[PDB]
Design a protein around this ligand. Structure first.
Ligand SMILES: [Cl-]
Ligand SMILES: [Co+2]
Length: 162
């Protein structure tokens, strides 16, 4: 199904996701629903934290054709380098963008939708999106890198979209 994506200032968005236990049909059901939710909302990423499922699951698709599904279960950063930034958005912070510092390249380890371990070296938009979504799983938002005043203005803007 298309799931309910939480917005700030909801305190559940601040919870630390627990590691996935077993990659079984039930976790695969969450993966598949998260993709449907992500695509429905016009996104390039979605962390399980954002739909109120506090396990370490991320879905990504940065492709032009929208047919390149990346699944990261229990992801682990192995190395990063360089620095970069673009004006980032967030499905949990609707209509607000802001440039944030990021590593230019990352290397990660993860389990795929079958539970198979793999490694991935990323750069560009994919590297930035991987960093964005891993932040969610530890209860971190892109606004957290801006000044406290900017964080209060972003909140009141989104929060006056009833
Ligand atoms: Cl992003
Ligand atoms: Co986000």
């Amino acid at each position: 199904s298309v799931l309910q994506v939480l917005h700030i200032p909801d305190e559940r968005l601040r919870k630390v996701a627990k590691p996935v236990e077993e990659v079984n049909a039930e976790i695969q059901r969450i993966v598949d629903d998260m993709f449907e939710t992500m695509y429905a909302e016009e996104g390039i990423g979605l962390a399980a934290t954002q739909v109120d499922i506090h396990q370490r699951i991320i879905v990504i698709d940065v492709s032009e054709n929208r047919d390149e599904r990346l699944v990261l279960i229990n992801p682990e950063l192995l190395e990063k380098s360089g620095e970069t930034g673009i004006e980032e958005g967030c499905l949990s912070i609707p209509e607000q963008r802001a440039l944030v510092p990021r590593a230019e390249k990352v290397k990660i380890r993860a389990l795929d939708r079958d539970g198979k371990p793999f490694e991935l070296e990323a750069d560009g938009l994919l590297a930035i999106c991987i960093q964005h979504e891993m932040d969610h799983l530890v209860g971190k938002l892109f606004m957290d890198y801006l000044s406290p005043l900017k964080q209060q203005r972003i909140r009141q803007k989104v929060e006056k979209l009833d």
